[PDB]
Amino acid sequence: GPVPSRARVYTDVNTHRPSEYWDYESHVVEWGNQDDYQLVRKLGRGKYSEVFEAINITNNEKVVVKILKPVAAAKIKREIKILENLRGGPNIITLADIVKDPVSRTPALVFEHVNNTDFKQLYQTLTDYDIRFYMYEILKALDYCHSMGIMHRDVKPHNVMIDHEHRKLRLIDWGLAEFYHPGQEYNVRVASRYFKGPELLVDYQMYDYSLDMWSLGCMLASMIFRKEPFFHGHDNYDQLVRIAKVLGTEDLYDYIDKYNIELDPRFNDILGRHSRKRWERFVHSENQHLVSPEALDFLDKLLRYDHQSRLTAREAMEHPYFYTVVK
Ligand SMILES: Nc1ncnc2c1ncn2[C@@H]1O[C@H](COP(=O)(O)OP(=O)(O)OP(=O)(O)O)[C@@H](O)[C@H]1O
Ligand SMILES: Clc1cc2[nH]ccc2cc1Br
Secondary structure (H helix, E strand, O other): OOOOOOOOOOOOOOOOOOHHHHOHHHOOOOOOOHHHEEEEEEEEEOOOEEEEEEEEOOOOEEEEEEEEOOOOHHHHHHHHHHHHHHOOOOOEOOEEEEEEOOOOOOEEEEEEOOOOOOHHHHHHHOOHHHHHHHHHHHHHHHHHHHHOOEEOOOOOHHHEEEEOOOOEEEEOOOOOOEEOOOOOOOOOOOOOHHHOOHHHHOOOOOOOOHHHHHHHHHHHHHHHHOOOOOOOOOOHHHHHHHHHHHHOHHHHHHHHHHOOOOOOHHHHHOOOOOOOOOHHHHOOOOOHHHOOHHHHHHHHHHOOOOOOOOOOHHHHHOOHHHOOOOO
16 A cells, blocks of 8 residues: 655654644633624635624724634634644734634634735735745744644645735634644645645645645745746646646656555546656746746755655755845
8 A cells, every 4th residue: 555654854743742732622612702803894705614804892903703614623623723822923823812603603713914915916016035035934934833743734825914014924724724643644635726735636645744835836836937826727637737747747656656656547548748847948038037046946846746855844944045035
């Protein structure tokens, strides 16, 4: 069957922590006062929650309220435990309160509000320096959560809030986040299609923090090459073919051979044979100002099939691409 795998960093953070730290099922939720919050406007709705802008009437501060849709208490306590564990961490969204919504009769998570800049404007206006600056900020949040034994599993642009005026970044939406336990087989239905790592696309369940580094690489490629998304699959199968058209099929077969993974036979008549492309192939007059040899080397070290070969968040922070960023 498949060869086992373990993270090359932060492998035993959870084994050496009190069981209360990662045993989210055993956690007793402390409930706040729902009357402290006045809902102002609906910001969005997904399969798992409705999101509102609200006012905390005890301090007149703006907050965001995520009212959870009917889902397993396992996912609810997991998100709460992760948010409480990471609270105060660099660039991690702050969970301000947990209240029972009187209408839905489900938990409502109250978060600090971030005055988020339009994503389309950010994507179209970020300069070379801003891309490096904000990528260093996201790495601080990822190294923190990884060092705390947690994988985010849904890194994507909509989950990175940026207040471009105050040069403030927050990593949000921890509903898919999970505690990393060496040897544990996880669900591969995580992350959004365009940001799914090859490990999820080939059904390899013993993955780790390095999944987030693939997702970060996908964001980087889309920003420096001005191609959103970078890997534009029609579905989860075409998603792997789109990756293989860039990284090539030889390295893909070496990856699956290393872990003794057998690809779904449905890939036999869609994967083809592709060579690895040089990153310069994606450079053109409209994105050249965002590309440098340091950007391409950094990208090359994130976008690797073998999850064990990708840079960790801390190694990424050491890369020459960030030497220009004021620290
Ligand atoms: N802490 C926050 N401060 C300000 N706005 C937030 C905060 N958290 C979420 N939002 C905003 O709430 C809105 C709705 O969120 P929601 O996650 O449902 O949709 P979304 O960002 O389009 O996500 P997805 O792409 O996953 O569907 C978004 O515009 C999001 O930026
Ligand atoms: Cl790190 C980062 C996160 C982001 N979220 C939306 C745009 C955007 C750009 C960068 Br660079």
